[PDB]
Each structure stands twice: as C-alpha cells, then as structure tokens.
C-alpha cells in the first residue's frame, strides 16, 4: 500500500482481521518460549498493531501528498469491546464503526451503532 502513498497516489488497506493476526503472533512467541503476558499474548502485542496502523497516513506536500488509509477489522466475543485486544486497537485508530447483531436483526443494516461509532477526523473529510 505504501508504494502508492509514497508515490503520490492513494491506497486503502483492509486488515481482515487483526484479531486473528494477534493469535498467530502469540503462537510464534509461545513456541519460541518468550515468556507470555496477559491472556498468554506477548507483552508487546499492542505494539504489534500500533506500529502497523501508524503506517497509514496522509503525507506532506514535500512528499507528494500521497496517502494510505487503513480499515482494520477486529472481532469481539459476545459484544465484549472491553476485551484485551479490542481495547488496544480502539486506542490506536482514529474512530470506530461498531456493528451489533441486535441491530442486524431489527432490520438495521449496516448494523452500525451510531451512539458508539465515531470518526475523529470528523467533518474535515466529508463532502461539504
């Protein structure tokens, strides 16, 4: 994706999904015998994602105004947004789209929870 960003074009990247990536990263670590942290993940499982998603950016003019936009996906269990890895990534990104099964079945699709959903960039990146 960065090739496009670096060379004055625009790329969107979708990481589907980072829940599963962390699980893999844990496997590596455990078998390498790196002493685990919370829920058996590596101590730096936040850094795993934080450095990844920091690479999505809008570059300056001196760098040709190219951009990489990230839509990472995260899976919760039983609506537990308060879970470990969900909490990490929420604190990384610039806003969240929150989908609810309860809304899916009331007919609301996309099942977006407006109350909980934000996009911090706000009306700076919305058509006037």
């Amino acid at each position: 994706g960065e090739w496009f960003r670096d060379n004055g074009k625009h790329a969107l990247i979708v990481y589907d999904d980072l829940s599963k990536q962390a699980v893999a990263y844990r496997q590596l670590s455990l078998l390498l015998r790196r002493p685990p942290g919370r829920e058996a993940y590596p101590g730096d499982v936040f850094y795993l994602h934080s450095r990844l998603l920091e690479r999505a950016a809008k570059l300056s003019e001196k760098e040709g105004s190219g951009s990489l936009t990230a839509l990472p996906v995260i899976e919760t269990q039983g609506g537990d947004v308060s879970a470990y890895i969900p909490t990490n990534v929420i604190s990384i990104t610039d806003g969240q789209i929150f989908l609810e099964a309860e809304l899916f079945y009331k007919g609301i699709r996309p099942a977006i929870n407006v109350g909980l959903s934000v996009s911090r960039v706000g009306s700076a990146a919305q058509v006037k």
Partner: protein
Amino acid sequence: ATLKEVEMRLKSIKNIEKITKTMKIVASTRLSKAEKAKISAKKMDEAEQLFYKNAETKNKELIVAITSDKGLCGSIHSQLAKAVRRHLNDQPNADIVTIGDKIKMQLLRTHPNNIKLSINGIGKDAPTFQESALIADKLLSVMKAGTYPKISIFYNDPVSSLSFEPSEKPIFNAKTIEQSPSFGKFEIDTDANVPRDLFEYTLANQMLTAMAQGYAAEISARRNAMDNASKNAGDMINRYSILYNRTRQAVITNELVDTITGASS
C-alpha cells in the same frame, strides 16, 4: 458474560425488585383509603340510585370511559377498553369521552374518530366531587351532553382485592326522568326544573361513584401486579447472583493461571 456486565445487570434488577416492592406497600397503604372511598360511594349509590328504581326510569350516544393515567396495574385498561369495544359494535356512531390517558391510548388505536374529549392527570389522588363535577361541567358545555338520548359510564367494578369486573351503567337526561313510568309516584314540585337538576347532579355523582370504584379496582390490581413483579424480580435476582458467583470465581482462577503460566518459565 463478563463480571462487569453481570455486576450491573444484577444490581439493576436488585433495584427494580426494591422498587416494585415499595410500590406494593404504597398500594396496600392506599387500600385502606380505597374502601373509605368505595364503600362510602357504594352507599351513596344505593340512596341516589334508589329514586330511579321506584320511579322506574328507562330510556347518537355518549360513552364515558373511566380508568387512569398510570400503568403497572395488570389488565385494568386492557379489558375495560375491550368492554367498550364490544359495546361499540352495536352502535359505531357513539361519541367517546375518555377519563384517563391509558384508556384514551387504547381506544385511539381502534376508534380515533369517536373520541371527542379526553380528561387528563387523574390516577394520582383518589377521585373527588370537584373533578367529578368539573368534568361534568365540561360534558354539559363542550360535549353538549344534555342532548344525547343515551349516556353510558364504563368503569371497573371491584368484586374483591383479587379480581375486578369491567362494568357499565346509564345516565338519564331530563326528558327521560320526566317521562318515566312512576315519576308520578312522587309529589315533585312541577316548578323550577327538578329533572334538569337531578340529571346534572346524577351526572357528576354516578361518575364519581364509577371513578371511586375504578380507583379501588386499580389500586388492588396494581398491588397484585407489583406483588408478582417483586416475586419474579426477586426470583431473577437469585439466578443472577448464582451466575455472578461463578463469574467472580472464574475471574480469580483465570488471573491466577496467567500469573502461574508467567512464572513457569
């Protein structure tokens, strides 16, 4: 699922349960007040109503439906509206006046054009003659009540504290009082319209009698309603507390495992 979730749900019901039970004693208390309003209006019901039996009074129709503004009282408004509806087939061209919002809501979902006046903010204190009389004053004025050949009062009749009975009773206008079979059994002074007064007084009175019984019927239903709410609310609390304790114990074990795994290396 999570202790934090189960903590709030358990504590939420723990309140609903204490709520419904506080509203079940507030009901029981208000019930001593209720019979002092029922009996004292059922006795004024023998005396007021007896004239009409002896005079043998009989008879576009005006329906007055009576319940209240407040829910949490079983099927009080549901089946009363069902009695009015059942009656409303036999004459769909009736004009409805609603005393209470809950009953207004019920009949507005089914007969919105028939409703011409709604009396509000009722269910709070016990019914008084002032409300009774001022509603009556509105019917006579705005609804032009005196001109309908038929007036009906629907209200709940409290047979006991365990169940009630949706009821009906008629209010006779001046014309009908005058022309009754045995109206000339009484030495009535033919002068200053007595049938007029007797009608407009009975219009307030039998409304109050109705409200006073409907009230009593509601308070005894709300009590029984809260009584089961508290029973279920309390039974749920047991199942959730049990769930809590599992989830508490599980949180201790799982933290202890992480810590043991971490030290293992």
